[PDB]
Amino acid sequence: ISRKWEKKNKIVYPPQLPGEPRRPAEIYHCRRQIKYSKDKMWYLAKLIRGMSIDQALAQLEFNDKKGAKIIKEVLLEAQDMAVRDHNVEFRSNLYIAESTSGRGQCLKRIRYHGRGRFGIMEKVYCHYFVKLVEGPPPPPEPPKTAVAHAKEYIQQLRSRTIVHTL
Amino acid sequence: RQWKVTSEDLILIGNELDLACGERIRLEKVLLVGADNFTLLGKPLLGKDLVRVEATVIEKTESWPRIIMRFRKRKNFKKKRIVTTPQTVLRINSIEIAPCL
Amino acid sequence: VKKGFRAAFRFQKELERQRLLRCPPPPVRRSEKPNWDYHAEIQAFGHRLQENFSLDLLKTAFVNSCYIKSEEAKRQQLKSNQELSEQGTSFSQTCLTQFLEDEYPDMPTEGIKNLVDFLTGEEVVCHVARNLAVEQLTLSEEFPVPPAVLQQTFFAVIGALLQSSGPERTALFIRDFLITQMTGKELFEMWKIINPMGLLVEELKKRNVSAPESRLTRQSGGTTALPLYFVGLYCDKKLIAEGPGETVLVAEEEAARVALRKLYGFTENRRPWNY
Amino acid sequence: RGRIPGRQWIGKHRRPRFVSLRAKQNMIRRLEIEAENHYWLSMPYMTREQERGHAAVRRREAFEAIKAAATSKFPPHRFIADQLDHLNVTKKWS
Amino acid sequence: LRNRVTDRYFRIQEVLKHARHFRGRKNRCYRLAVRTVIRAFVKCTKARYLKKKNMRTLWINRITAASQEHGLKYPALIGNLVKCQVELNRKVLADLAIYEPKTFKSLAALASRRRHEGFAAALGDGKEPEGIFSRVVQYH
Amino acid sequence: IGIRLTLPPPKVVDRWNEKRAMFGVYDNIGILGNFEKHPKELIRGPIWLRGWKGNELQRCIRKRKMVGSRMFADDLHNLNKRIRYLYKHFNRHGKFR
Amino acid sequence: TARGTPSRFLASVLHNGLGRYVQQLQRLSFSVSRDGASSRGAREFVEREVIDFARRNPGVVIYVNSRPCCVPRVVAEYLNGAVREESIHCKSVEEISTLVQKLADQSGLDVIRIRKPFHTDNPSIQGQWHPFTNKPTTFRGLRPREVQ
RNA sequence: UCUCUUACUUUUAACCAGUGAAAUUGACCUGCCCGUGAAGAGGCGGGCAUAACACAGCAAGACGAGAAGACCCUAUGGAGCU
RNA sequence: ACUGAACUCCUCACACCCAAUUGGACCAAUCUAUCACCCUAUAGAAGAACUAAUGUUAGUAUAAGUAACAUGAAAACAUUCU
RNA sequence: CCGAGCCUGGUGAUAGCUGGUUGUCCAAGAUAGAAUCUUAGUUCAACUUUAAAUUUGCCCACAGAACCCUCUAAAUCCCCUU
RNA sequence: GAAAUUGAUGGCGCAAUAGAUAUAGUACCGCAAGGGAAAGAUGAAAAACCAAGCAUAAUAUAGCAAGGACUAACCCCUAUACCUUCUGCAUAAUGAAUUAACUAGAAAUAACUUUGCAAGGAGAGCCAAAGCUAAGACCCCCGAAACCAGACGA
Ligand SMILES: Nc1nc2c(ncn2[C@@H]2O[C@H](COP(=O)(O)OP(=O)(O)OP(=O)(O)O)[C@@H](O)[C@H]2O)c(=O)[nH]1
Ligand SMILES: [Mg+2]
């Protein structure tokens, strides 16, 4: 097994110079061996990607999926450790930069079928990962306007060369 | 081959020319010499006293590996060969014309 | 476990390669890396450029003031290249001015100055030094060498060449290594100008020619999103130049640029430089 | 619609094929070349009696060369230098 | 397991390196990657003939375009240049059409000149004086 | 993944231990000792292949003939079956006949 | 293949031929071994050819390092910053000589597919063709069907 | 039963939540018509069509999955019976 | 008249496109004898090389988050009701 | 899972039948029939491969190779020269 | 397929799909005989980057998914997966989901090449009208329905 996500919290950056932008705090948290399918967990992860901590908690509190409660607990733990250990000043000033689900260690069981035949059940387990970044959530990527899209087309037109000649 | 050439041009000849790099050469088979307002055409080759094209052997190299692959379905016929073709890059230094028309 | 060592060794080497690619090492000056000898490298520099540099002068040119300060600080815990760089810069400017004025007698003094500034600028000189290995032989207190220090070292090398071989050989060196940098470049790519129509009007007034008249020579797809406008400047009902553009204003500006190029003798089809 | 029964070009009911002006011209060109060949073959220089034996010597010498090549096949020579040169694989510096 | 293969990683990589840019499992699975890579190499080998053929086709198309601009058809231009004894090939002719329009106009004028000289000779069949541009420089 | 991620432990071979140093000694015992002993008498190993060589069938036949009575029950059964199979293979199967 | 490999255009390091030819190769590091059959040819090259090559090419610094090696190598460093490492493992004197001469005559530019066998910074002398070339002009610039 | 099918209830079903198989699977970026062809094309030729994606149905095709066809023939292949 | 092959010419180089079968030159890795000592050389050996056997074992996919499975109701969770 | 049980052993049964038969490169390489419980196979021949010895090999000028049968095909065999 | 007769100190082994089936004849399977597995890896002390599959990161018209290319991923042009079998397969004939590991040419006679010695060769035997001695090279894997013997089963 691999446990690099936990280790990611132990990297210490060199002290920043006075004339340097303040580095946003990054907190890596995870929960391992959740009795839940990673495919089902991925939907919740994708839902909360890119949102503020408070918005993600609010969305999860009112979601009927089992994984929602687990993700809410993980997010609360991440917030607590960010405030206590990673010198994050405000609880709410955190956004989910990364949220993914990974395959866990799964157990194999037998499903009995009708004619002495069988299938191999998989007691599925999944991991859950979160990175919380300090600061307001990055603004959503604006849809590209007609002006920008036509500008791209004209750039493509200008990029044309006389191919296969001097 | 026939190359359309001008001063400061680079030409990639697909073989070794048996010349040390940085050595000056005269390209003797000039079919056409042209300017903004006039062009002179050979029948089929222009005169030495009319045109002098000079080049310099800038580089001697081997081409990037070329794959020669032969395959026939359902015959256990598969063959592969890697070939690198010698090459020489020449820089055309000058194209000089003389009043001998 | 499979008995054997050679496959494992190959895999270890490949893992090292992948590790290096994923985490590239910080750049280090070639002096630190193995297989380096300063005297041999500098002699090879001279022979490669095919010039009889005096070794002491070349070493003085390569050594910079910042290197001296750093070395003194380290000693706490040498003649710089200032004069050589000044001499080389002055000679390069004067010789490039001579070349450019001889080649383009109609070019204005401002144009010649701008071309000389382009040729002796940080970008061109830095590129030439980097590809001539001046950086490797450069003694500085930080790596990679900053463009200013690299330019100073390159001009110090030129000054050392002047003091060793003479003005003629130095002029040949400049012609070979800086004048060549204007090949394929465009006049206003090297000399940035604003209001080319104004410049053209001024030049024509100095030459005693009637003010140019813009005239739409050709047009295509005027009402579309991709128009073409060939606008020609006519003096005394005579075409001095014509330029294409997307809009009429852009076409007129480009036609003014073409007219300026023709007047200054820096046309694309001009006589190639004679080396 | 417009099916040719079976395989085209082989069966009793084949796809019709029509000669183009191009094909006719090509065949006529080849026919002209062969007519010129007939003309140039219709004028022998020597007669059979005149040619009899005029190349016998050269043909015999050529076959003698072939026979010599065939009968000279023998294993190649072997030299002590070749055998002793293998000792150089462990040639080292000092 | 007296003797076992220990290089199979590198043996697989020698093939997968050329399949990394494929789509789907053909860029990951050796069983599929090897087939796709063999096909790609065969295509690359066979594509040189097509490269030359398409280069000549492109040159012919461009020469046709320029000759039509000057009012001549490609067969006329090529045949009459040959008759003028100018041995410019199609690559060079297309390059001239693109980058030296005035030179190509001169060449088209020469081709039309020779074409009209040939027409005049055919019309006035006989021992009339040969066209000025129809004279052929003999070599020995 | 069939390749180890670490270099195997260095393998040191003593080229000058007693066995290697004295290897080959007395191989010329016969020619250099009035032929009192044949070099094949220097071969230490199974009794049925001391100074003798043959294919698998011949080796099995010799083993059964020389030590078959002293073999274990299942080992002797295996040897008999191997002899049978090798007989059939060598006398009835093959490209050349 | 071309689509599976990077490509570049024909070019020179600093317009290598306009003013004067400059040998792009600057450094040649020969890692050789006193013992080991792999470097027999390298040893013979160092004995009989390296001196001649060095004097023939005075602009190239050659560093012959004799250390324990199973695979003797030659590292060629070019003015442009390119490094080409070639194995001279079990190569005869002639093979090593040819390889070294090829490195000397070769520029530092990458050995990849070259898109065009030629490179011109001034492809046009008479004016690059545009749609309005070979098109006559009309009186007062009147487009077709224009009334006035 | 049918002419001639309709209405409702339960299960099933569809959506939400938990748990979670099976055959199958060369790779697929997996269209229609005509022609071709190892003799019945999604992949070939000529045309036509063609932003990308889910969800629910259908069973015309993928010579669909399933069982190395039980029919038929062969094997100096078996076995049962007379 | 032109277009048109891997035919032919052209510049350089050439052993470098037939199934079964056959001849030959090299060679990955392993061990052994001597070398070598950031991966090797000369030889001797052999369980000596896998895109394919409805191949064996193990892992993980597709089908699929699909087919299927489950807890009568309220409540003080004492109890009551259907 | 009984036209004759199941397990173990002989047993790696045998199979003219099906399937599979793993590094690189070059070269030569498609060709009459006979016999056979034999036509799904094999031996001989023919062809093919390799190495070796030797000298004629192929193409082919006249001349020449049947009457039955009154006439009658493309051709063939043989064959110096070349 | 004889007999007379002759005389007679470890590893160019495996190293957890290997080597014993074996961590065990245990677990499990079968009424019974009987069949029969899998696997573990820290450190001196614990009293201290790489398979497949996915995710980061769904997708754009068109097509064995690539090649020629190109400024440009696609758009343009060219291109009927592989293996086996066959007269002939893109074939709508077989096999294959994919990754890792394992998985299949054994040898005599006579020849050929290379040595040694030579009317003799060979370390008894055998061969010899240049032979003889030695070496090199030289022939696969899975699969039946079956048959028989002895046990186990109402
Ligand atoms: N070939 C072989 N030699 C063995 C074996 N076991 C022991 N030996 C040899 O027996 C010799 C003596 O063994 P040691 O253990 O040293 O001494 P030991 O205990 O007196 O020996 P034994 O009397 O044989 O029990 C050595 O030469 C060993 O190599 C074996 O299984 N095979
Ligand atoms: Mg599953």
Ligand SMILES: [Mg+2]
């Ligand atoms: Mg048909």
Ligand SMILES: [Mg+2]
């Ligand atoms: Mg559900």
Ligand SMILES: [Mg+2]
């Ligand atoms: Mg059809």
Ligand SMILES: [Mg+2]
């Ligand atoms: Mg649907």
Ligand SMILES: [Mg+2]
């Ligand atoms: Mg249905």
Ligand SMILES: [Mg+2]
């Ligand atoms: Mg299909």
Ligand SMILES: [Mg+2]
């Ligand atoms: Mg079916």
Ligand SMILES: [Mg+2]
């Ligand atoms: Mg069947």
Ligand SMILES: [Mg+2]
């Ligand atoms: Mg029946």
Ligand SMILES: [Mg+2]
């Ligand atoms: Mg029978």
Ligand SMILES: [Mg+2]
């Ligand atoms: Mg052609």
Ligand SMILES: [Mg+2]
């Ligand atoms: Mg094997």
Ligand SMILES: [Mg+2]
């Ligand atoms: Mg494998």
Ligand SMILES: [Mg+2]
């Ligand atoms: Mg398989």
Ligand SMILES: [Mg+2]
């Ligand atoms: Mg799923």
Ligand SMILES: [Mg+2]
């Ligand atoms: Mg479904």
